[PDB]
Amino acid sequence: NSLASKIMTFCFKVYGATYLQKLLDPLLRIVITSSDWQHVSFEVDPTRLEPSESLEENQRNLLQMTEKFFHAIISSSSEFPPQLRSVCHCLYQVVSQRFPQNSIGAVGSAMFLRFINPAIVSPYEAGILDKKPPPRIERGLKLMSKILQSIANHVLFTKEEHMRPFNDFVKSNFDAARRFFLDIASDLALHRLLWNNQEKIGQYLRPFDKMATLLAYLGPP
Amino acid sequence: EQHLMWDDIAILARYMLMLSFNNSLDVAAHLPYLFHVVTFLVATGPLSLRASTHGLVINIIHSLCTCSQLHFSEETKQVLRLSLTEFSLPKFYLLFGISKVKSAAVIAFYERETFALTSLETVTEALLEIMEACMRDIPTCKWLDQWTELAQRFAFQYNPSLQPRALVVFGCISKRVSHGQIKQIIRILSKALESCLKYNSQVLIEATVIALTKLQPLLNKDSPLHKALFWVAVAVLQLD
């Protein structure tokens, strides 16, 4: 988390809120209102698994939910708002000056890590839902975002042994997300903030001096 | 301050402060001549005269923001408003040889900072940015040309007290220069170094070198003098 990292997440926030909200809310309501009928469980950690539930069955439940969630994101190119498409392309070109090889990967990871996945894990706090989903859904959404991040980072699971069974799923969807990233990446009391940090703006190495006066006239009122 | 006519100048500077608020009616014919007076006076003499001379500039800038005869743009007016703000800063107090005071006004109505020409350079470019901003809006004026002539006259003529100040100003304000003017400046530098064989001389050397600094961006692209001035600088550094 640096200032430029804050700037990027802010642009995703103020421009993609309506984008995420209308994209994830239908799938979430299908996961809660529907499929609450059965004992849907996404628990794939064996040491955490109840004796009554089945590992093979829960593993399928996770991949099905992850599949339609991933499909809805990849197929959402025609609904991507233009302000972000400008942010990701601006991010695409600047890194390409120093890392021209696979520079598109950095855009897609930050896209999923700082924008898509945090709203998937916590839909209520992101403003997408009216209340938190049931506890069994919250465990599945957290596990799904771990899979979706592996796809975005183009890296297999190598840490937790219970996420390796999904490596075949993430290895196949590598380039589908890579195509989606290549798509979206191609085309106030300010004076109160100014004067509070105005002290010694001229520490550099004309405009900083000029600026100190406007800060002293506007801010001190 | 020693000069045979110092009192006569000091008196007129006093009048000029009082007049300067009424100069809100006056400035349009005068503005160059007032900065010519500022240029010589800017930090000189007893502290009350310095305070007066700071006030003189403040009041002139304010007068340029409101003369009912003028029609400056919102950009030009904003530049002047920000200039008033800038001249009100402690930085400009030190430039005018004011230190140890809350308000220049109070003292206006010695601990000479032994005058640093770099301070006059700073003032002069600020007054130049004021004049330039205005001159865009008033195409029918001759102000900078008259200031150039007035400063030029005093820069080139022999007068140990004023000539350094004038050279600094001439250099700062000018928009063109000739090899014959540079010859006169470097001849002044040389004559000032002869006088060092025989403080005032040193201030004249500093002035000529500052003048050469401002003047050298003006010189013609194929002039030898750009290369020559590097050695003028080297020789100056050698002085210690």
UniProtKB/Swiss-Prot annotation, chain A:
Detected in brain, peripheral nerve, lung, colon and muscle. Residues 1-184 form the Ras-GAP domain. Ubiquitinated by RNF7/RBX2, leading to its degradation. Changing residue 114 to S: In NF1; significant reduction of GAP activity. Stimulates the GTPase activity of Ras. NF1 shows greater affinity for Ras GAP, but lower specific activity. May be a regulator of Ras activity. Binds phospholipids via its C-terminal CRAL-TRIO domain. Binds primarily glycerophospholipids with monounsaturated C18:1 and/or C16:1 fatty acid moieties and a phosphatidylethanolamine or phosphatidylcholine headgroup. Has lesser affinity for lipids containing phosphatidylserine and phosphatidylinositol. This is Neurofibromin. It comes from Homo sapiens. The lineage of its organism: Eukaryota, Metazoa, Chordata, Craniata, Vertebrata. The chain holds residues 1278 to 1549 of 2839 of the full protein.
